[PDB]
Design a protein around this ligand. Sequence first.
Ligand SMILES: [Cl-]
Ligand SMILES: [Cl-]
Ligand SMILES: [Cl-]
Ligand SMILES: [Cl-]
Ligand SMILES: [Cl-]
Length: 248
Amino acid sequence: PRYLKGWLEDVVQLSLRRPSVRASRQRPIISLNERILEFNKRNITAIIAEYKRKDPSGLDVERDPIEYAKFMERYAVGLFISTEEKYFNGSYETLRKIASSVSIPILMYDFIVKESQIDDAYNLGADTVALIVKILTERELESLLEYARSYGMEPLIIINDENDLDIALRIGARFIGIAARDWETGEINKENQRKLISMIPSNVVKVAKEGISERNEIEELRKLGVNAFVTASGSLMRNPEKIKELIE
Ligand SMILES: [Cl-]
Ligand SMILES: [Cl-]
Ligand SMILES: [Cl-]
Ligand SMILES: [Cl-]
Ligand SMILES: [Cl-]
């Protein structure tokens, strides 16, 4: 992993030592990027619902994992399931339970730094994972992108700035997540987000990671070419029913 500081460095160290899990997949691969394209083709707003109990820059949230996932199965294009333990209060067991309970795509959201975590995601029932440019060397990215693809999963490469984007396109990523929030400060920069979105080739499936909170903001990024959206952190955990308004 790259040289880091703060909670990011600590979570990267925690990931490096994360034990592999014993489990075997009993679920098809329900591709997230392809389903996003399907929604686009039907002109249906594609919203990826996030299940997260905690955030190093947010407040805690308690809500039944299965209940939430089953509710979202009716509206969301897919789910983001946080599995990082210390700062996000995530769990491999939670991902497994959820994956066994719904038929829509699931992305295991964690800080992937080694192959065994991708094995874990596949074995637990996730359909894909996110790879974060900020914490990975180019070499690690190339290697993890290929490993994920060998399982038939197209990973979501998360970028925060121009250099991140250049590296993503350089290695051949086709599924890119543009983050509106800053990892360390927790600050939202919509302008930077829109700029990066405007620099991405049309054949790359683009996901706006936060940066939108209501239907009208979704409409605007949709015109900039954004394919799918992950809404402002905690908004759906607080008001699940709001997704209906978002995709109306
Ligand atoms: Cl920064
Ligand atoms: Cl802003
Ligand atoms: Cl936002
Ligand atoms: Cl917003
Ligand atoms: Cl209603």
